[PDB]
Design a protein around this ligand. Structure first.
Ligand SMILES: Nc1ncnc2c1ncn2[C@@H]1O[C@H](COP(=O)(O)OP(=O)(O)O)[C@@H](O)[C@H]1O
Ligand code: ALF
Length: 951
RNA sequence: GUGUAAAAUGUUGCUAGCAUGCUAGUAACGUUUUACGCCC
């Protein structure tokens, strides 16, 4: 009854018990009765090695299988009677894991005495359980616009701006006279649509303060309007008294548009057109030049001043990203206060009425967009055409989910015939491409093939699948090219390269190709209205790089993205039900996003209360976002609760990194490890791959794993790689490139990290911290012992990236907070196939890749002594003398020792505050603070928490 | 994006026997669940 003592249940425990006994016997069958009333008596003997009480089953049935089942019934009943078998044994039985045992403290008495002296030498008692605007000026002599300062030397110090304007004018006249490649580029730009209303757009801008351009995508407009403004300003011989400032919302888009405008101008990058993306600047000449930058770089430059720039040409606003709307909200008042500035907002296809209404009903210009509506087809249309039904043959939820695929009427074509024949919907197959090919060959429509896959992972998977199906994946006849941010610029520049007809172009891309760039020859668009949704859930610190449906506005744009003049075809892979069911627009990301970084930015520019500023924005954000920004600023001691920016906050604002790494960079110079902190912050915030993985590789190679050395950490590997790269860069790069390739170095990532380290140390120098601590602290990896610099660097790392720590159980299988299973990313140095146990069973990662908290990246072993030092914002005490870390980690330490360790929590903040207050003398601290530095260097040593008992 | 053993279904052919059928299994088949152990 209670143990469901029947045949097809409760037998799992019996099977396991017999497996433990290894008895391979079964039921012997004996016939009883005639052939018309046949019965079988089955026998089985079971030996019990634990109770020494052998049992037997002798039961009858209508057949051999029935006899065996009847015997097993009585066997389970007798095993229960024996009180040795486990009851129930249903289909519900899992196997999980938890903490086994740490090395809780077990320190030497020296460190205990040091900690006691520190807690008594610093008196840290613990209990044992207004709206102004940024000034702007017109162009001025001896003043550089880019650097926002006075050059006071060179040529402008003695040369008037009018002379520079005349020089630019004569140079452009000579270029008009002779530059033939410029002639062909300008004729291409003239046949380009915007050159229709050249003068018109050159005048409307002077007419009004706020100017909105509106014209369908693919006009080649961003790369032309700024150049036309410069040309108009220089044709009057005034190019010196004019500069152009443009902001894109994506880094790679900014790089691409800068390269395009340089190539069309037939000029080397950095002469008259330059770009300043985060951690990279190629600033051009100070006068008569164009600047492209991301919104973040402009928000950074806003601190100094917009002096010396003529017109600002803010790019795509339909993105609705937080940065662009913040910039627009500031720029509204900026251009209202100063009537001599010209703000330009650019869109692609959006009801710009709200944008115009925001700026006091500003003019909404228009571009004549030649177009031809394209044939739009859906899943019913494609099932009518060439079959569409089959496919490749918190946990859950409620009934609120509606499957529109299964809610429809079968008034369409032979749905059952298509189902019984074939199809492949979720994964594309020969069907779609062959249908397009036959449509082209029968209706005579040679044209490019365009698809919008949501993510780079799916892009790579489908590219590999189509390469496997190379009969129709034949690049010689069916050219295939991806397009995404991650891939190098070589693929982007190859995409634009045309191919002869017959070599069909099948472009695989994502939301990037919907704007920014546009291929002229696109005819047929195969949309799936799927896009990446890399959302960070800061309310619980879970990442989700999932895929979500595109908005109806975006879907309409994609429908219009193809078919310039040719008919064009839209092969939408969705039903009309979902087509009309999804939201018309896209949810404003500004509504749901933490605003701590923007709060620090607004407090840096002394723009008054954040609440009032957010009220006077495009969309009044919900009070939760401003409240959470306030909470983060108050708890992190960047901004006081009384809207008073402490020097810590002002220092953090200038840092081009998130505050969670600025808090580490502050302490980096405190403990004489600033180089390590700069390198780690650059390698962490700038999400990048450490090593150049070769094709067909599933793990890290021999040297790729040996570079981490005895430390066996990817962060230590990166540090030593940077050290060897810089000592090699001390020599020539001709052999350095092949050496880095041999060492599996990413080269470009290393350059980025080095430049970021240089910029961070320059910023720290400007802050006031001494140069002496900013010296090389070279760490070797072959040493398996201890090194104070490296262990304090790792302790600071664990301080910063909280709560991205994890507990290792076995192989890839690791545990994360709230007891979540996870694996180790392939790029990590801790990837292998054999079972290895690490010296310390605690790891901290950088990123949580893949939505279902599975992939962890940037793993590095951490000392078991973090506990309360650098492991959390909260520590607790559990039963049976257990210290609780992040409510998912257990240590076994005396409450007195736990309180002693936890008393350091206010001390860290006090040290940070003192370091920020007096940057000039961080090396020469107060004597209790020198003792604190000494004790923290002593405590975080790798082989420290093992005294008394190594176990 | 996987294999092993166990159990319910029906199936392929065969087997010992009974007044064309029948009483039982056999080797194999796929389905569904169970755990065992991989790789992302
Ligand atoms: N790398 C390039 N080489 C040549 N022409 C380009 C390049 N990139 C863009 N163009 C042209 O410039 C135009 C750019 O349009 P775009 O910047 O997307 O305008 P908007 O952003 O207003 O839609 C396109 O029509 C395209 O033909
Ligand atoms: F210039 Al755009 F989207 F129109 F980047």
């Amino acid at each position: 009854i209670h143990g469901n003592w029947t045949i097809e249940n409760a037998k799992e425990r019996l099977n396991i018990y017999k497996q433990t006994n290894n008895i391979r016997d079964d039921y012997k069958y004996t016939p009883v009765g005639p052939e018309h009333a046949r019965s079988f008596l089955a026998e089985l003997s079971i030996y019990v090695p634990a109770l020494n009480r052998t049992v037997t089953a002798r039961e009858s049935g209508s057949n051999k299988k029935s006899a065996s089942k009847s015997c097993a019934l009585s066997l389970v009943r007798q095993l229960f009677h024996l009180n040795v078998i486990e009851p129930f044994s249903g289909t519900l039985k899992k196997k999980k894991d938890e903490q086994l045992k740490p090395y809780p403290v077990k320190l030497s008495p020296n460190l205990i005495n040091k900690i006691d002296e520190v807690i008594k030498g610093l008196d840290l008692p613990v209990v044992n359980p207004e709206s102004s605007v940024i000034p702007w000026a017109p162009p001025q002599a001896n003043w550089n616009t880019w650097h926002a300062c006075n050059i006071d030397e060179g040529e402008l110090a003695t040369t008037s701006i009018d002379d520079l304007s005349m020089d630019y004018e004569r140079s452009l006249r000579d270029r008009r006279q002779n530059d033939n490649e410029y002639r062909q580029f300008l004729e291409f730009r003239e046949k380009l649509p915007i050159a229709a209303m050249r003068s018109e757009i050159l005048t409307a801008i002077n007419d009004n303060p706020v100017v909105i351009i509106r014209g369908n995508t693919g006009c080649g407009k961003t790369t032309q309007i700024a150049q036309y403004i410069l040309d108009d300003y220089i044709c009057s011989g005034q190019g010196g008294y004019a500069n152009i400032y443009v902001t894109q919302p994506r880094r790679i888009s900014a790089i691409s548009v800068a390269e395009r405008v340089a190539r069309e101008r037939c000029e080397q990058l950095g002469d008259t057109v330059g770009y300043s993306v985060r951690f990279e600047s190629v600033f051009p000449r100070p006068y008569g030049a164009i600047l492209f930058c991301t919104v973040g770089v402009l928000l950074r430059k806003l601190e100094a001043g917009l002096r010396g720039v003529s017109h600002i040409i803010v790019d795509e606003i339909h993105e609705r990203d937080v940065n662009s709307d913040f910039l627009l909200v500031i720029l509204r008042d900026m251009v209202d206060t100063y009537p001599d500035l010209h703000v330009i907002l650019m869109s692609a296809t959006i009801d710009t009425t709200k944008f115009s209404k925001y700026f006091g009903i500003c003019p909404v210009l228009e571009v004549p967009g030649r177009a031809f509506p394209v044939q739009q087809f859906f899943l019913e249309d494609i099932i009518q055409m060439t079959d569409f039904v089959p496919s490749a043959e918190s946990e859950d939820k409620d009934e609120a989910e509606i499957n529109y695929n299964k809610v429809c009427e079968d008034k369409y074509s032979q749905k059952t015939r298509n189902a019984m024949a074939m199809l492949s919907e979720s994964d594309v197959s020969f069907e779609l491409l062959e249908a397009l090919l036959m449509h082209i060959k029968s209706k005579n429509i040679p044209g490019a093939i365009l698809v919008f896959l949501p993510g780079w992972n799916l892009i790579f998977a489908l590219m590999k699948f189509l390469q496997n199906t190379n009969i129709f994946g034949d690049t010689s006849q069916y050219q295939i090219l991806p397009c995404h941010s991650q891939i190098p610029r070589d693929e982007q520049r190859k995409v634009f390269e045309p191919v002869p007809e017959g070599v069909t172009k099948i472009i695989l891309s994502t939301n990037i190709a919907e704007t920014s760039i546009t291929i002229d020859d696109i005819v047929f668009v195969i949309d799936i209205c799927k896009a990446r949704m890399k959302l960070f859930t800061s309310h619980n610190n879970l990442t989700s790089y999932a895929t979500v449906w595109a908005s109806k506005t975006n879907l309409e744009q994609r429908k219009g993205r193809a078919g310039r003049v040719r008919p064009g075809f839209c092969f939408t892979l969705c039903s009309r039900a979902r087509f009309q069911a999804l939201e018309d627009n896209l949810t404003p990301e500004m509504f749901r996003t933490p605003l701590h970084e923007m709060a620090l930015t607004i407090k840096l520019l002394r723009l008054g209360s954040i609440h009032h500023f957010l009220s006077k924005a495009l969309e009044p954000p919900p009070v939760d976002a401003v409240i959470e920004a306030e909470v983060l600023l108050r708890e992190m001691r960047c901004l006081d609760a009384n809207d008073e920016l402490t020097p810590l906050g002002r220092l953090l604002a200038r840092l081009p990194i998130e505050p969670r790494l600025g808090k580490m960079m502050v302490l980096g110079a405190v403990f004489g490890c600033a180089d390590l902190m700069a390198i780690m912050a650059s390698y962490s915030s700038t999400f990048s791959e450490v090593f150049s993985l070769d094709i067909g590789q599933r793990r890290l190679a021999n040297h790729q794993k040996a570079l981490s050395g005895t430390k066996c950490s990817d962060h230590v590997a990166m540090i030593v790689a940077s050290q060897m790269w810089r000592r090699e860069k001390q020599r020539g790069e001709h052999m350095e490139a092949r050496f880095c390739d041999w060492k599996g170095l990413q080269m470009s990532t290393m350059n980025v990290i080095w430049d970021a380290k240089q910029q961070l140390l320059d910023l720290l120098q400007q802050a006031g911290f001494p140069e002496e601590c900013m010296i090389s602290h070279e760490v070797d990896e072959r040493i398996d012992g201890d090194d104070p610099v490296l262990d304090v660097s790792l302790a600071l790392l664990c301080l910063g990236l909280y709560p991205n720590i994890c507990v290792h159980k076995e192989k890839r299988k690791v545990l994360t907070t709230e007891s979540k299973a996870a694996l180790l990313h392939k790029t990590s140095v801790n990837c292998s196939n054999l079972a290895v146990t690490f010296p310390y069973p605690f790891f901290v990662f950088g990123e949580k890749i893949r939505t279902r908290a599975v992939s962890c990246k940037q793993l590095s072993m951490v000392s078991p002594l973090q506990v309360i030092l650098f492991g959390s914002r909260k520590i607790d005490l559990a039963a049976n003398n257990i210290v609780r870390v992040d409510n998912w980690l257990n240590f076994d330490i005396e409450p007195e020792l736990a309180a002693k360790i936890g008393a350091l929590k206010p001390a860290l903040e006090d040290l940070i505050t003192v370091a920020c207050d007096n940057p000039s003398d961080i090396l020469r601290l107060e004597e209790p603070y020198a003792q604190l530095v000494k004790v923290v260097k002593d405590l975080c040593v790798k082989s420290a928490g093992d005294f008394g008992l190594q176990r």
